[PDB]
């Protein structure tokens, strides 16, 4: 039974080239190039899911650091205070209350100050 | 009916079409190199060049006797468990009961005491055979 392998192939072809729209070049157009790019796009998106976990953490850290240094304390000592005080907030919500509430963040900074030991010995 | 017919789960195995995409058995189909095996098949004789185990060993001693008088045997103990009563048997009765093939010359072997009163007709008795069958009341024959 000679099969005429068109339909079977056009399935995945239309797959790739609908998940490939919006590509500058011969990539939304042609199929093999859309496939080369699909492999690269999905490794990029895979790497960027992890990468973005880490990157948002680094951004939040930059922000908490900026609000801390607005309160004359460094990010290191801020974290060591929010640890020793124990307020189990995390850098994400800590940065949110940093943005919207300078008041709540400065309460947090005074919390951290009140929970620093004495010195650079211990 | 026919819309209610399935094999036993265990048969009707999936054929392995090999060169079908690098997800099942992909490119090389199992001969995964550029070697000789990757295009053709080296025989079972060829061994690299050193004499194969079928050339360095010696041909087995002795000849084959063209006139080898091959028999078919029937077990005196299993001729007991063929005929519990017995009394009268003979080569035709063996092939009838299905103890040995047709077109045959028979020997009767000697494993197990034949404790049935039986007389047996069959060429070429063995030592223990004639012993047991002639001690079971009956005797041997030709």
């Amino acid at each position: 039974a000679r099969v005429k392998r068109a339909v079977n192939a056009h399935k995945k072809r239309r797959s790739i080239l609908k998940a490939s729209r919006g590509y500058r070049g011969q990539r939304s157009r042609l199929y093999r190039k859309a496939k080369e790019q699909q492999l690269h796009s999905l490794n990029y998106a895979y790497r960027d899911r992890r990468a973005r976990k880490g990157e948002f953490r680094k951004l939040w850290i930059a922000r908490i650091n900026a609000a801390a240094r607005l309160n004359d304390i460094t990010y290191n000592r801020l974290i060591q205070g929010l640890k020793a005080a124990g307020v189990e907030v995390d850098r994400k919500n800590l940065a949110d209350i940093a943005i919207s509430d300078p008041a709540a963040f400065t309460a947090l900074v005074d919390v951290a100050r009140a929970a620093l030991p004495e010195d650079v010995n211990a | 009916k026919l819309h209610d017919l399935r094999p036993a789960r265990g048969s009707k195995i999936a054929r392995t079409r090999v060169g079908r995409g690098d997800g099942s058995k992909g490119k090389t189909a199992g001969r995964g190199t550029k070697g000789t095996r990757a295009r053709k098949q080296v025989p079972v004789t060829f061994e690299g060049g050193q004499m194969p185990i079928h050339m360095r060993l010696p041909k087995l001693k002795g000849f084959r006797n063209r006139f080898r008088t091959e028999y078919e045997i029937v077990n005196v103990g299993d001729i007991n468990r063929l005929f519990p009563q017995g009394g009268a048997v003979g080569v035709d009765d063996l092939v009838a009961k299905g103890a040995v093939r047709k077109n045959a010359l028979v020997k009767v072997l000697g494993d197990g005491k034949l404790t049935a009163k039986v007389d047996v007709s069959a060429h070429k008795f063995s030592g223990s055979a004639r012993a047991k069958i002639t001690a079971a009341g009956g005797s041997a024959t030709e």
């Binding site: - | 079972v44 185990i53 079928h54 060993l57 010696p58 087995l60």
Partner: protein, 62 residues
């Protein structure tokens, strides 16, 4: 269409009463003068083939 038994290896191998193939331990044919008797009662008999020569020998026997 009808498989050939490799002749040369059926004239050198012997399927016994069960699944054993017995080669002939016979570097015992040409020069038997220097060879001590020990090395001939070492080379007089029919040795069951080892594992690392079986899977092929049987396909030579078929």
């Amino acid at each position: 269409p009808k498989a050939k038994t490799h002749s040369g290896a059926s004239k050198r191998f012997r399927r016994t009463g069960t699944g054993k193939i017995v080669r002939q331990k016979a570097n015992r044919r040409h020069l038997l003068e220097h060879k001590p008797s020990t090395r001939t009662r070492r080379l007089d008999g029919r040795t069951v083939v080892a594992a690392n020569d079986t899977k092929r020998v049987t396909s030579l026997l078929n």
